[PDB]
């Protein structure tokens, strides 16, 4: 299996074993599996991680200045800011997307895609 | 020999040739279809546990919908995922067929078959492109006026190319058409040449050939379905 | 020759019409049906 | 020899050239144009719509030159000119 | 009348593939799809009761 | 010498003209967008039904090319357009 | 067999091979073509009106070389240069 | 003089020779496409090798299957000649 | 049978095969070339000017080989050497 | 003119043909694989037993064509058919 | 006939073929090569002149293989090996 | 006329098709293998050792199939099968 | 009739086809590695002095394969096997 963390500016937010780690970087989606080769990249503006862990449901991850980096012994996301799912508030996310401030559009965006409503 | 284009059953009518084995199979699979089509009607299970068939017809109309969701909204083009469903269902029924083991011999050392696919005569699949091409035309008639419509296709996206433009106008129903045939017209030459070997030794390659034809046949239909739902899409936009 | 057609056409497009009529009245409406109500 | 036999056997060798390289250069286009098609939708999901666009611009020039190349094939063979 | 056999004895091993290989995925998506199909329905009445 | 004889002898180089340009078509437009399924598919493990959508589409537009000469191939042997 | 014969088969064989040539040249042309727009449009969707002004003028070469191609074949069928 | 059957079985014989010759570039060309594509997502995904597998042998038998009806069509052309006489 | 006539057949056959390569040449290359050119001004608009450099010397490379073809095809076809 | 010298000479110049097509396929396509498992072993030092086994997959395929090729152009070549 | 039609027909279609290969290579070459430089030049604008040397040899390699065949061509044609 | 002159000219162009068939593909084989050589060298100079090993390889590989090629040339020129 | 005269159509034909064979093969494969080597330079300004041994050693695979096609097209025509 590949250890996840979610790691934070302030705080390391999350960290464990997953399955499966899908995101959107600039290129396009990416899923990693257990022994994808080393990478680097960065996550679009209105990035989402989605971890499939061992046993568990899934983990959707709002995320807000995202980079990614594949060592094949675990994965590690740098984010600015993030959001669980359980955390984010639908409403919030709905009123401070389709602004015209591109960073606050790219997160409410970040969240919608989070929530499952895309 | 391998005898191409030969047809049974010929007869005559109104001074016009009727090729009896194409009319015959042609029937046996609106004969199929129908079968399957009332079978779900009198088995719909809107509440209770749906049944195969019943699966079947929803996964091909999920599918088509989603097709024509992507490319143009159901709303606009609602008629075109019956045309679509029935078109695949059509093609596949009349493919699959062919799998069935009605392949004899002639008494002079020729392979006939009882029963051969329909799409392998010109006329099968002409009927077919050119029913889709007419009615797609006739909805971006619709859509977009009666001179609308013939500027839109003639000018395309880009006016400068609107000679070229005009070509694929053509090539769209005979694309649509050769290309059917063709890859099954292969498959009633292939059995038939694989029928000159000795039966102990005609059989491996005769059933890797209907296995992989198979395959064959349902991507032909899935490929005719979906290109006719975006012929459609182009035809009815703006 | 095989390519030029013939009045089995017509005949084939005949059969095909039909074919589509009750795939447009007793198949695609009521799986519709099925669908929206699921 | 029957100088017509000759000019149509001519005739129908240069329709099979043509018709080779129509059916060569129709099937690496489509095929490149498709894999263009391909990554698109795969990097980017929701760009499906706005990719089928233009692949089927290009993908008409490429069955514009295979048509074309057809037409001529079938004057070439139907009727052959310069044919006594 | 050969030709005949051997292409009947070739369909033969092409049922022999279809049943052993084909078979058993479509059951299995078909049983897949009815159970989900039973689950959505119980759980609406779950719902209802609930 | 028959005429007929050179007929077919120009209609069976014509026909393996056809076919072999529409195999190498057919072939590499295959082979081009089977690459990019299996590269989206590696980039994306979990993309992979939504690639079968498009990859059809393209192996439909780059067969076609091959069918239809192989059409026309028959038509050069089978029924041979000039045939005295 | 009179000469004409023989000139007229080898003008049809000739232009057999220009449009085969101008084919395979333009259908491969296109596909590359059309795969990189395709590819551009894909990245950047607002780059699309930015875009077609190098495509279609790398089409208008390409195409324009087809149709130099065609134009001399249409010399070489229809009025051959040499046919006494 | 020149025996009919001669020309018609030397036309067959070149045109099966076409038929091979362009059915082995298709299918050599194809197939090492699709390696290469196969090569490159096993490298960069070791555990997708199952999944890439499938897409891997439905370009191939795609791109056989126009090989072998090459084949069969140069079978066709060489030993039960059409049009010969 | 006149020589002439077997010395036009060859030389329209050899201009043939001649504009074929040529135009197969010419039309990959500027569709390769064009293929460069579209991705990079995808890129970054901005280089278009100095890209517009480049692009024209591979594409003047290119067709310089096609009117070399073209006009040797000119001399076997009108000014045949070895006439006689 | 004996009859078994055309067929001869048609089935050497079939044969040919054969082999010319069968090492265009092997030789693209083998350097193709190998280009493959050369970026990925350049890429990673340690993969190179698990991209062996798909780059001999990828080999075998080429080669089996290549190979066929080959045993049909000794049929053609060697015992001829039609040959009297 | 005169055996120096036939040596001349053989002759012509040669040079045919020779100037075909060589402006296949060539245009094929040439655009690989301006696409390399073109994208060198799109990510690397300052990196033309670091550039342009390689791409210079590259081209010299592919214009002298096609400058080779051309005068192979020109020995062929107008100074024909074996002619009497 | 000599039925043995039909024989070898036959052999002939059959050879002349198998080396430039072994031609096209060992030259664009070794191409490839030499481009992913030259990719790896640039991202990891310390490869070099390493990566001529999968080179080696390839580019056996390919020349095996251009030497088979070579070798059946010259047994079609020198010692022609159904040379009676 | 002359025998000669068809020996000497057969290879001139045969040299030609060696000839186009080995100018695409030459051709295309210096135009890849020539792209290969230009994009790391642009990649590595300092690798110029370490990607041309493998280039070298590429190029040098090609034009041996294009130098061999040279020795037997020379074969061919020159001294003609075979000749009688």
């Known amino acids: 299996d590949l250890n996840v963390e979610i790691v934070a500016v302030e705080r390391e937010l999350w960290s464990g074993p997953a399955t499966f780690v899908f995101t959107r970087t600039t290129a396009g989606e990416i899923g990693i599996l257990p022994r994808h080769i080393p990478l680097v990249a ?14 568990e449901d899934d983990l959707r991850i709002a995320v807000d200045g995202g980079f990614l980096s594949v060592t094949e012994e675990t994965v590690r996301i740098l984010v600015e800011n993030a959001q669980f799912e359980s955390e984010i508030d639908a409403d919030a996310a709905k009123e401070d997307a389709a602004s015209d401030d591109e960073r606050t559009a790219a997160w409410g965006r970040a969240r919608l895609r989070a929530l499952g409503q895309i | 020999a391998i005898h191409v284009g030969h047809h049974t059953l010929v007869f005559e009518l109104f001074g016009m040739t009727f090729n009896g084995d194409t009319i015959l199979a042609t029937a046996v699979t609106a004969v199929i279809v129908i079968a399957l089509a009332f079978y779900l009607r009198a088995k719909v299970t809107s509440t209770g546990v749906p049944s195969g068939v019943q699966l079947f017809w929803e996964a091909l109309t999920i599918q088509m919908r989603q097709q024509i969701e992507g490319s143009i909204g159901m709303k606009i083009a609602p008629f075109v995922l019956p045309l679509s469903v029935t078109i695949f269902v059509f093609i596949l029924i009349s493919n699959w067929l062919a799998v069935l083991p009605l392949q004899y011999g002639g008494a002079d050392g020729a392979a006939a078959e009882l029963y051969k696919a329909p799409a392998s005569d010109i006329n099968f699949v002409l009927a077919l492109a050119l029913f889709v091409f007419v009615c797609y035309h006739a909805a971006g008639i619709w859509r977009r006026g009666i001179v609308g419509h013939p500027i839109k296709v003639v000018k395309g996206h880009v006016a400068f190319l609107a000679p070229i433009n005009i070509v694929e106008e053509l090539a769209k129903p005979i694309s649509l058409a050769l290309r059917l045939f063709g890859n099954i017209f292969a498959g009633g030459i292939l059995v038939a040449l694989i029928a000159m070997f000795p039966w102990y030794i005609q059989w491996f390659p005769n059933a890797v050939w209907k296995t992989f034809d198979l395959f064959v046949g349902l991507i032909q239909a899935f490929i005719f379905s979906l290109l006719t739902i975006l012929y459609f899409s182009q035809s009815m936009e703006l | 020759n095989f390519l030029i057609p013939n009045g089995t056409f017509f005949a084939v497009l005949i059969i095909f019409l039909i074919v589509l009529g009750v795939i447009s009245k007793w198949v695609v409406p009521p799986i519709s049906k099925v669908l929206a109500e699921r | 020899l029957d100088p017509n036999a000759i000019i149509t056997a001519g005739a129908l060798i240069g329709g099979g050239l043509i018709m080779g390289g129509g059916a060569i250069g129709a099937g690496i286009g489509d095929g490149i144009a498709g894999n263009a098609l391909i990554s698109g939708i795969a990097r980017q999901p929701e760009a499906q719509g706005r990719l089928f666009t233009p692949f089927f611009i290009t993908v008409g020039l490429v069955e514009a030159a295979y048509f074309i190349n ?15 | 009348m050969s030709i005949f056999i051997g292409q009947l004895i070739g369909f033969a091993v092409i049922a022999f593939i279809i049943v052993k290989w084909v078979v058993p995925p479509v059951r299995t998506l078909m049983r897949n799809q009815q159970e989900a199909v039973r689950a959505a329905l119980a759980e609406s009445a779950e719902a209802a009761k609930k």
């Open chain 1, 42 to 55: 960065q996550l679009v503006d209105d990035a989402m991680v989605r971890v499939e862990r061992e046993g």
């Open chain 4, 70 to 84: 057809l037409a001529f094939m079938a004057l070439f063979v139907f009727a052959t000119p310069g044919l006594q």
